[PDB]
Amino acid sequence: IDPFEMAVKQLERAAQYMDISEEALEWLKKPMRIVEVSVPIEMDDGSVKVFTGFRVQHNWARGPTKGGIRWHPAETLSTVKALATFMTWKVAVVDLPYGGGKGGIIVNPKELSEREQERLARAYIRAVYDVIGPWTDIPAPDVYTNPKIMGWMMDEYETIMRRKGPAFGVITGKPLSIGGSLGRGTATAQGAIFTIREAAKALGIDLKGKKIAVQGYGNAGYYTAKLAKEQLGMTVVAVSDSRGGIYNPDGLDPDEVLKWKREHGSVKDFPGATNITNEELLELEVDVLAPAAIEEVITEKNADNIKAKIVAEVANGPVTPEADDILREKGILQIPDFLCNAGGVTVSYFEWVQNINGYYWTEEEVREKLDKKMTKAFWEVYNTHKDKNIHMRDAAYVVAVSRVYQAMKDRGWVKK
Ligand SMILES: NC(=O)C1=CN([C@@H]2O[C@H](COP(=O)(O)OP(=O)(O)OC[C@H]3O[C@@H](n4cnc5c(N)ncnc54)[C@H](OP(=O)(O)O)[C@@H]3O)[C@@H](O)[C@H]2O)C=CC1
Ligand SMILES: O=C(O)CCC(=O)C(=O)O
Ligand SMILES: [N+]
């Protein structure tokens, strides 16, 4: 279905668990500002190629909009709008002074050289300059988009701004040399681990030796497994990748699994471990299930097969609403995706704060601030879920949309 219509339907489904005026719902149903520009670059051969770029600012009631830029050949305006709407609730759920934004360029970066990529990054900034800024709209890395491109775009923005204000704060995810932040690489996994700790505390169970079956071995998944093993007292018993997955009741070492995967191209066939399908790992007797590879790994046809006490949605939407309602019945505690993986945007906010203050924090301060933020956000969502007797995803929507509504009413944008 159309991603934007799906996001609007999700917001409308959330709207009936809270008292929100019709005018506010109609306001939140459409992005406040959408910018579509031509992005011309000189290719290596010498020809000029024009690309289509997007920058959607859904809502800036709570502050400047935040959201990454994805370089994908299948990128559409509808997807960018849906993701900007999602970023609004994402930043609202962790109580950030941010709004929701999103950008994108319809391009295949694989067919682009380094110089062509830098030209594209600089031309995108030269085109969307008038609607971005450290207090207006702060982009970030996304799919096929990395700190190198952030450094290039930051440099272009500083050249246009003539170093008048803090140009480091215009974009996040930059390298450490130019206004980068420590703790950025493990932000999503660290936040997910904090939320898993809070969820286990809510369930009133001890984590000394409990099984965890991480699904996926990306930047999310590998670090999620490593931190679950490291400072959580847990026991990694199953990890998986696109090619396959492994299982060991005795225990597992995430680092030895990662180096084997890097030296062979996949985790599959880890010595001393039984190779199992990703489906078999999804339905495995564990306490924490943490999908961090791809969305929609849990469906109605297999939702009943999950026995995990906690399902930590590190991936961006791995559970469907049908499976959501099915899994709520069994008593399985669910952590919504835009609450579980909010550590990335929280550390991006920390980077922006350090940039605007001109003062940079150590790893320990970043970790502690993120710990407090994630703990507060999870407890706010869970108390709403228990008080209203609703699904954790619905409670997170109620919290985020309520925050944005309150900001909109206080600005006077809407009356009722
Ligand atoms: N970690 C982060 O910084 C962030 C995490 N997320 C979400 O986390 C998810 C993963 O991101 P991240 O791990 O960082 O990066 P990647 O998506 O690059 O890594 C995910 C890995 O999971 C494996 N995988 C891919 N598809 C499947 C599949 N169908 N079944 C099983 N395993 C699969 C692959 O391992 P391989 O191909 O090598 O076998 C892949 O490299 C995404 O949905 C993302 O939106 C959210 C925000 C940021
Ligand atoms: O980190 C950010 O500010 C936004 C990146 C993004 O799109 C996300 O985390 O979903
Ligand atoms: N994030």
UniProtKB/Swiss-Prot annotation:
Reaction equations catalysed: L-glutamate + NAD(+) + H2O = 2-oxoglutarate + NH4(+) + NADH + H(+); L-glutamate + NADP(+) + H2O = 2-oxoglutarate + NH4(+) + NADPH + H(+)
Enzyme class name: oxidoreductase
Xref: PROSITE patterns: GLFV_DEHYDROGENASE
InterPro entries to which the protein is assigned, alphabetical: Aminoacid_DH-like_N_sf (IPR046346), GLPV_dehydrogenases (IPR053388), Glu/Leu/Phe/Val/Trp_DH (IPR006095), Glu/Leu/Phe/Val/Trp_DH_C (IPR006096), Glu/Leu/Phe/Val/Trp_DH_dimer (IPR006097), Glu/Leu/Phe/Val_DH_AS (IPR033524), Glu_DH (IPR014362), NAD(P)-bd_dom_sf (IPR036291)
SUPFAM superfamilies found in the cross-reference section: Aminoacid dehydrogenase-like, N-terminal domain (SSF53223), NAD(P)-binding Rossmann-fold domains (SSF51735)
Catalytic machinery residues: K102
Entries under Gene3D superfamilies matching the protein: Leucine Dehydrogenase, chain A, domain 1, NAD(P)-binding Rossmann-like Domain
Positions annotated to bind NAD(+): G216, Y217, G218, N219, A220, G221, Y222
Gene Ontology biological process: glutamate catabolic process
Taxonomic superkingdom: Archaea
SMART domains to which the protein is assigned, alphabetical: ELFV_dehydrog
Alphabetic keyword roster: NAD, NADP, Oxidoreductase
Catalytic activity, EC: 1.4.1.3
Any one GO molecular-function label of the UniProt entry: glutamate dehydrogenase (NADP+) activity
Subunit structure, as described in the record: Homohexamer.
Family membership noted in the UniProt record: Belongs to the Glu/Leu/Phe/Val dehydrogenases family.
NCBIfam families linked: GdhA_Arch (NF040817)
Protein name: Glutamate dehydrogenase
